[PDB]
From Swiss-Prot:
Monomer. Gene3D superfamilies: DNA-3-methyladenine glycosylase AlkA, N-terminal domain (3.30.310.20), Helix-hairpin-Helix base-excision DNA repair enzymes (C-terminal) (1.10.1670.10), Hypothetical protein, domain 2 (1.10.340.30). SUPFAM superfamilies: DNA-glycosylase, TATA-box binding protein-like. The record marks W218 as: Determinant for substrate specificity and/or activity. The keyword Transferase does not apply. This is DNA-3-methyladenine glycosylase 2. It comes from Escherichia coli (strain K12).
Length: 282
C-alpha cells in the first residue's frame, strides 16, 4: 500500500464518473470509492487499486504481488491517469469564470500510451458507450487473463495486435481501415516510433502522428490530451464540442478557444461538462 499526494480541490466524483463510463469490461472496475484495473509492465502482471482519502488528500495505491517488482512505474502510471501534479489554483486562476463551476476538475490521463492510442482510434465516429463495448471485444479476443485474478484480463499487447487478422478486428464492429490503423499502431509501438511519454514539442509530434494511416486530427488531439496529458489541446472537431458551439465551424471554434491558452485541455474538460454552456459575443 503506497501513498501519493494531491492538492485540493480534487473532484473525485467527476473523475471516477468519467472513467466508469469509459471503463472496459473485464479490464477496469470503477466504483464510488475506488478504481482498479489489470496492468502489465513487461512480463509483470497484476491488479492495481487506487483508493482516495479525500480528507487527507492522499491517494492510496494497492498492487497485487505480480506488480511489486515494478511498483514505482505502477505508481507513476496512476499519477498520470489521475493528474496528481495539477495545481488547481493556477489553472482556475487563468481559466477564470469557466472553471468556477467545478474547480476540482482534473485531466484524465492513461496507464499506457499504446493502450490509449488504441482507445482513441476505437473512439472514432462513435459514442463513449459503443466505444467501450467495442474495446471490450477487442480485449476479450486479444487480451490475456490473469492467473491469480481470473476475473481480470490485460489489455491486448502490441505483439498480439500486430499479428491480428484485419478481418478479425473488423468483425468486432469496425471498418477495415480502422482495423488496419490499429495493426499499424501496434507495430509503431514495437519499433518505438509512437511516443510513450509526452514529447517536448507536441504540435510537431501530433503532425507526425497524423501521417499514420487512420489517424485524423480528432484522434491525434484526443490521443495527445489523454495519451500524453498535454494541457493545451482543444478538440474543435469533437462532436459534443460542435453542440456547445452551434453554427461555428471547426476553424471558428479553434479561434474561440485560443483565449484559454495555455490550458485548453482543461478548458475542453469544463466545456464538455457544462451542460448549458454557450459562447460569448464580440
Ligand atoms: O471521431 C470522432 N470525431 C469527433 N468527435 C468525436 C466524438 N467521438 N468520436 C469522435
Amino acid at each position: 500500500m503506497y501513498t501519493l499526494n494531491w492538492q485540493p480541490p480534487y473532484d473525485w466524483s467527476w473523475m471516477l464518473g468519467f472513467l466508469a463510463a469509459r471503463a472496459v469490461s473485464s479490464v477496469e472496475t470503477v466504483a464510488d470509492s475506488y478504481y482498479a484495473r489489470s496492468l502489465a509492465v513487461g512480463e509483470y502482471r497484476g491488479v492495481v487499486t487506487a483508493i482516495p482519502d479525500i480528507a487527507r488528500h492522499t491517494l492510496h495505491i494497492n498492487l497485487s504481488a505480480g506488480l511489486e517488482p515494478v511498483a514505482a512505474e505502477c505508481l507513476a502510471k496512476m499519477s498520470r491517469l489521475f493528474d496528481l501534479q495539477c495545481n488547481p489554483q493556477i489553472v482556475n486562476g487563468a481559466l477564470g469564470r469557466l472553471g468556477a463551476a467545478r474547480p476540482g476538475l482534473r485531466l484524465p490521463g492513461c496507464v499506457d500510451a499504446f493502450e490509449q492510442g488504441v482507445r482513441a482510434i476505437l473512439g472514432q465516429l462513435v459514442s463513449v458507450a459503443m466505444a467501450a463495448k467495442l474495446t471490450a471485444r477487442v480485449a476479450q479476443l486479444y487480451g490475456e487473463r490473469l492467473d491469480d485474478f481470473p476475473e481480470y484480463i490485460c489489455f491486448p499487447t502490441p505483439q498480439r495486435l500486430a499479428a491480428a487478422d484485419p478481418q478479425a478486428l473488423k468483425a468486432l464492429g469496425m471498418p477495415l481501415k480502422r482495423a488496419e490503423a490499429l495493426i499499424h499502431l501496434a507495430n509503431a509501438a514495437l519499433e518505438g516510433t509512437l511516443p510513450m511519454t509526452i514529447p517536448g514539442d507536441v504540435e510537431q509530434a501530433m503532425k507526425t502522428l497524423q501521417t499514420f494511416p487512420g489517424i485524423g486530427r480528432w484522434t491525434a488531439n484526443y490521443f495527445a490530451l489523454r495519451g500524453w496529458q498535454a494541457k493545451d489541446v482543444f478538440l474543435p472537431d469533437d462532436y459534443l464540442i460542435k453542440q456547445r458551439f452551434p453554427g461555428m465551424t471547426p476553424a471558428q471554434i479553434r479561434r474561440y478557444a485560443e483565449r484559454w491558452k495555455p490550458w485548453r485541455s482543461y478548458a475542453l474538460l469544463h466545456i464538455w461538462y457544462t451542460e448549458g454552456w454557450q459562447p460569448d459575443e464580440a
